[PDB]
From Swiss-Prot, chains A, B, C, D:
Protein name: 2-dehydro-3-deoxy-D-gluconate/2-dehydro-3-deoxy-phosphogluconate aldolase
UniProt catalytic activity: 2-dehydro-3-deoxy-6-phospho-D-gluconate = D-glyceraldehyde 3-phosphate + pyruvate; 2-dehydro-3-deoxy-D-gluconate = D-glyceraldehyde + pyruvate
Entry keyword set: Carbohydrate metabolism, Lyase, Schiff base
Site (Proton shuttle): 128
Residues where substrate binds: 41-42, 128-130, 153-155
Residues annotated as catalytic: 153
Function: Involved in the degradation of glucose via the Entner-Doudoroff pathway. Catalyzes the reversible cleavage of 2-keto-3-deoxy-6-phosphogluconate (KDPG) and 2-keto-3-deoxygluconate (KDG) forming pyruvate and glyceraldehyde 3-phosphate or glyceraldehyde, respectively. It is not able to use 2-keto-3-deoxy-6-phosphogalactonate (KDPGal) and 2-keto-3-deoxygalactonate (KDGal) as substrate.
A GO molecular function held by the record: 2-dehydro-3-deoxy-D-gluconate aldolase activity
Native source organism of the sequence: Thermoproteus tenax
């Protein structure tokens, strides 16, 4: 079972910094990340222009051997163009959010979007489902009804919703994206996890996976609860910005910054977070 | 009290068509539209490039005397740039959605976004609130606390939520954005309405306004109910794409197309919509 | 247009005090309440035994000329039984919540419940819709389909939702039950309001009704906002218990108390609430 | 890890039939049910009078060695009365929903409800959490703060929400109540499940438990998916009434019926369900 990192997009001086990005990717893949997922929500995907996603695709595919690229755009031609680009750069798969923002698009519109993406490339197309952010759900039955989905990332608190993709699409690779469900995902033998914490504590996720595989459910659960406490503190100050500071805290190198509306944490927020996780940090035998 | 059109963005072959747009704006403003609101949700704002939004700003300010440009972007630098551009082209105000898509941004991040817009321009900055599409609400209390909001457009079926902005911001111009609340907005004396149906039935909205002003409450209401039957059919088939077909059906000229993932309606959907609205339309006597 | 009070159920000791109830009914009906609605949510309906509701029926019909009895029970035989009892005591109508609590109920079960109710009496049966408390909505289209509904009380922040009942059911008496929409309800000419504040400020509700009729929209809105401030303070300490204390503050007599798990406000909560509404209270001229 | 049945309440004639009930309890306890949970949502608890719940308590404590009685009432005095009665009859624990139906009760009211319940008995008080039905959540933090909660049954699609009670109350016994999470609950080593399917397919739940315990984690998931198919079908016609028919289909004896507003299935619905679950039934064996 795989640890997939929905990797942060590392800005510095207003632009993408591929040196920060490459160092970060090479570190986390050394610590147990199997696959790099670029331009996911944790990577600020919908905030990135097509060219920024191309730059990120180049950086990810030159830093990691296994890369899935998130391609969604509210101009659907851009999703097709980037999917072809990712494929040419050696991505093992592409993924897409369903069309987001607009309420009450039709089922026909959603289906055409995904079918056009599948027609554009030969590599597997993944559904990246995230109803809290997207404002709609493409559930297991709908995903099967599309007729071309070969993988699912379900960023979702409902483990049963995620398991249902394995039921309706027995050949798809299915992953849950909730940090609170890493332990549970391995326990029920999903194909893997795509959790934001693979950015800052990949060795913890690997510890959970190891523990579950050894039958050590108590250790796995304990590691999970430690992770939950860290996530909880981070959510308190703006989770998406905090992920970057958590990388600095736990991995010890510069992680860059997000970009407005996802403004970087200020100095006072960074200091508060460092103290907030100091205890959980000391408890870590990984 | 004003009728404000959140005007459609008119594409041809996935490219912006400013002639279709200009003809449409000229027509609805001759039929009772007081103000043109460009790149709102009905105008596919989040789907438009910055280049497209600048072109749309040029075309709207050329075709209309009173223009508000909606500037939101998930790259905040782009919101600031377009707000300054809009001001330079003579927009009377700019509006923005709160940062959307991303769940759990912090209050500081949201406040910074709006405050940076207000500091970027001298013309009024409006809150454009649309919780169903944005995934968060900036309520009247929150809008007061921003400390620079001079207008609100509230695309919201809770009319008291919209009225609360007049309570907390007595100097602000406050509009409700729901088609189902045009009659109600005029009856409670909001500053006006920003309803998508100003695109396809602006004469019907002016008729509602006239009836309320005449104390003809029963007429205003029966006109509202006719509009509600039309909105219902349109929603059934996919509302955002449906608006374009309704413009053609009710106003009698070409309206262009939306762009995918907001794909244009297909022939069967259009035929269905035409049959669906035919009854209600006939019961109209303006 | 009517002011309908969803009257509080006055307990004293551990049990219903029908005398306190009669007195309260008499005072508010002398101050503008047109109809008394017994055992609604504000009257703690779902917490009352059949015997308590029968007792309210007797006391209300003896103290008021126009009485509607709310009869919902999760034993449908008690609803049928009480509806018959209310008719026999001279109630002008009965109302029911749809079946509540249970999430997994079919359209057929809901329709059967309302149709059996309609068969049981010859007086009008109202739908009492309150989705936030009930956990389900019976919307205008569904209410028409039931085929026997003659009135609706919609406790709902969506004025559009309530207006839809007048569209689908032109001969029904339709009331909105939100305190925040009293002004709006009279402005759009619903048949009336069934607002909790008729317990403690029936003269304010009448003042709003008078102001709308006179066309003094600005006074109507101003009175609405004062009411909103009062409701907001009450919601802070527990609205259902707070209504009783607001009756005491504004009407000057003992209102009795609710019963747990709706526990009466404690002395500190009462002192806080008195102080919280003091300014709005002094600003009240009528 | 335990299988707890939220047992159906068995009506015949519109009245309780304690002999159908006894036969049912005895059968399911012989096929792997460890504990009987009486008057839960599956048992129509909120629909039952205090006397009916006492009668159910008698029948359960006569037919089974281990009984937990669900005691919630919207008259808290009745919750206390029943808890004392359950203890007198030899129940090993009582549980309660939080106060339901009423929106926006205060934290003080909810805490007083639970603490008063704990002080009435010397047997343990469990929290029975079911946010979808109750309209409010008492999460793990809130549960710990109550200070007297000894067990938790969380009917919730969010497994991380359930797991949190083990984080905060590691001494409490914690169960998840969603049928779609039986496999997952055993996999993460909750103390067990309280799933409605214990009524009709207890042997399937015991098979899932066995398979998780071997490590045929993949056969466990396969049995769960079969259960998910059957649940899917019952949900389609109205789950609460359908549970009774599923008992007849899979266990082959008379199950009684629910009582309206939870009306029994009609002959047509029953025929539809039997055909719908025939395939699943055929692949069962066990």
């Amino acid at each position: 079972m795989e640890i997939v990192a929905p990797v942060i997009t590392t800005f510095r001086g207003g632009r993408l910094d591929p040196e920060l990005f490459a160092n970060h990717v090479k570190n986390i893949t050394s610590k147990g990340v199997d696959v790099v997922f670029v331009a996911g929500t944790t990577g600020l995907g919908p905030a990135l222009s097509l060219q920024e996603k191309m730059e990120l695709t180049d950086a990810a595919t030159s830093a990691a051997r296994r890369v899935i690229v998130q391609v969604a755009s509210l101009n659907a031609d851009e999703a097709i163009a980037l999917a072809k680009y990712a494929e040419s750069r050696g991505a093992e798969a592409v993924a897409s959010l369903p069309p987001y923002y607009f309420p009450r698009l039709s089922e026909r519109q959603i289906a055409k979007y995904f079918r056009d993406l599948c027609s554009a490339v030969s590599i597997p197309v993944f559904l990246y489902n995230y109803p809290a952010a997207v404002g709609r759900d493409v559930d297991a039955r709908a995903a099967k009804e599309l007729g071309c989905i070969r993988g699912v990332k379900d960023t979702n608190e409902s483990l049963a919703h995620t398991l249902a993709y394995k039921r309706y699409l027995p050949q798809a690779r299915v992953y849950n994206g909730s940090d609170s469900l890493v332990f549970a995902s391995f326990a029920v033998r999903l194909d893997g996890v795509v959790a934001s914490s693979a950015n800052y504590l990949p060795e913890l996720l690997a510890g959970i996976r190891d523990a579950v595989a050894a039958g050590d459910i108590e250790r796995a659960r304990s590691l999970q609860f430690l992770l939950d406490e860290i996530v909880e503190s981070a959510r308190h100050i703006g989770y998406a910005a905090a992920v970057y500071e958590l990388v600095e805290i736990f991995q010890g190198y510069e992680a860059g910054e997000p970009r407005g509306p996802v403004y970087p944490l200020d100095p006072e927020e960074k200091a508060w977070l460092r103290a907030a996780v100091a205890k959980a940090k000391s408890q870590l035998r990984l």
